[PDB]
Amino acid sequence: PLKVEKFATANRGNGLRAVTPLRPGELLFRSDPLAYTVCKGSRGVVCDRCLLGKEKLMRCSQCRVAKYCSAKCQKKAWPDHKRECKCLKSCKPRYPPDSVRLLGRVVFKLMDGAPSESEKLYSFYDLESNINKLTEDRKEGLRQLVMTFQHFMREEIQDASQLPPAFDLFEAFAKVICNSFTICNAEMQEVGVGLYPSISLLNHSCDPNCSIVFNGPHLLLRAVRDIEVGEELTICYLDMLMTSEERRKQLRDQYCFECDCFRCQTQDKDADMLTGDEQVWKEVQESLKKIEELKAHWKWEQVLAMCQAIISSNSERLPDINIYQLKVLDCAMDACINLGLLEEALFYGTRTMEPYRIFFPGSHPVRGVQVMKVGKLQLHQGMFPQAMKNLRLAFDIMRVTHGREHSLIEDLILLLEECDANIR
Numbered sequence: 001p002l003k004v005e006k007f008a009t010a011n012r013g014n015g016l017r018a019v020t021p022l023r024p025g026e027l028l029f030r031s032d033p034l035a036y037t038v039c040k041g042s043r044g045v046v047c048d049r050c051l052l053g054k055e056k057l058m059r060c061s062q063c064r065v066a067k068y069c070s071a072k073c074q075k076k077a078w079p080d081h082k083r084e085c086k087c088l089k090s091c092k093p094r095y096p097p098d099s100v101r102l103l104g105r106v107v108f109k110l111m112d113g114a115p116s117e118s119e120k121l122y123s124f125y126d127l128e129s130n131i132n133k134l135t136e137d138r139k140e141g142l143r144q145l146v147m148t149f150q151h152f153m154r155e156e157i158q159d160a161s162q163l164p165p166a167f168d169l170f171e172a173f174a175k176v177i178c179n180s181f182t183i184c185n186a187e188m189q190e191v192g193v194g195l196y197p198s199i200s201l202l203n204h205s206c207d208p209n210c211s212i213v214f215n216g217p218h219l220l221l222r223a224v225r226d227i228e229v230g231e232e233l234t235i236c237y238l239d240m241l242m243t244s245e246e247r248r249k250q251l252r253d254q255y256c257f258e259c260d261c262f263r264c265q266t267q268d269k270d271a272d273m274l275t276g277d278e279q280v281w282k283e284v285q286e287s288l289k290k291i292e293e294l295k296a297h298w299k300w301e302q303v304l305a306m307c308q309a310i311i312s313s314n315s316e317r318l319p320d321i322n323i324y325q326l327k328v329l330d331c332a333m334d335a336c337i338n339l340g341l342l343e344e345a346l347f348y349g350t351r352t353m354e355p356y357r358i359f360f361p362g363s364h365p366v367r368g369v370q371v372m373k374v375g376k377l378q379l380h381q382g383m384f385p386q387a388m389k390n391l392r393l394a395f396d397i398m399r400v401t402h403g404r405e406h407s408l409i410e411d412l413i414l415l416l417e418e419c420d421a422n423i424r
């Protein structure tokens, strides 16, 4: 029994709208990807399937590239890894770009003929390409891949015979770039990327009515606010820690459009975001580029090296409420956590609590998780009174964003009751 529908929008291709009244936290759609892969960063640190930060990863006997959590995970992924395994062995040790490997996976999937439940609303051939509205460096970037693609797929693909006809590579990639989704783990860390054709119908907003969470590679679409019938459905395409400017910039450079959202048009919260001295945070912003490099690759130690310096450096001057300051804290935290310096972790993250409340308005999965992490630490620290507070708060947020359908709730409840037992 369905709850939404496809339609041609005002001026922007297609889109998605409701067909019933929808309350907060309602589960609207649910999909496995059509194709997905572990992104370069997390490669060789999470499983090419369940996508989970783990112990002892056995690597495909054949290619010796793909890594797997269990013997079952390996077996399950095999339908996909089947063909690529070959090429990955030839690339060794040169490893192909995510978007390339991803495409390989979509090629093969369209070459079995499975009525993929991810395409139930919009096929792959229906996806926007923006061919006519692309720049030149962009177009020249695309021809790049096609070349790198064909060298990579030498082993399995010799010519357009083995491709589904009415199918252009150059075109395909265009679809990829603006139709891809960043997959995150429980701790809202980016671990892989995939295409979710039915979900791609959702359009952008900087203050949207819908969220997406990932239970491993499995995607959940939920409502976040009360929605009246016939209303267009939107998610945010971006991180919420950006300025009206930054947002516009990427959207042009990646999706090829100018934003409509109220917020974009009236520089919403932009003052607060940049509150402070430009000269300080102009340097801070720069350092972060090299820092986040060492985050996607899980270099932790090295990130903390850089982080701790800057927070102690501009401790006298720059407030927590500034985004760049905050971003550092956020990192400083995720560092200490993966290092074990939990006392330190807490001391930091606890300071991100207030800014987050402000920047992540309503019910946002990121805020929830953050709160959870912070409460979880307090619980570890034995600050049960303050812990119970956040855990509850976090629950109250996540009961909307995740639902009983996401396994992380099961884990959060258990934390609540454990905290309970220490208040006995």
Ligand SMILES: Nc1ncnc2c1ncn2[C@@H]1O[C@H](CSCC[C@H](N)C(=O)O)[C@@H](O)[C@H]1O
Pocket: 012, 013, 014, 015, 126, 127, 128, 129, 130, 178, 200, 201, 202, 203, 204, 205, 255, 256, 257, 258, 259, 260
């Ligand atoms: N909020 C928004 N404002 C303007 N254009 C948008 C948008 N969200 C998506 N688009 C554009 O819609 C075009 C594709 S039309 C087909 C899929 C698309 N996501 C859709 O809206 O149906 C793309 O150029 C994409 O950037």
Ligand SMILES: [Zn+2]
Pocket: 060, 061, 062, 063, 064, 065, 066, 081, 084, 085, 086, 088
């Ligand atoms: Zn292999």
Ligand SMILES: [Zn+2]
Pocket: 047, 048, 049, 050, 051, 052, 068, 069, 070, 073
């Ligand atoms: Zn696994």
Ligand SMILES: [Zn+2]
Pocket: 205, 206, 247, 259, 260, 261, 262, 263, 264, 265
């Ligand atoms: Zn906007």
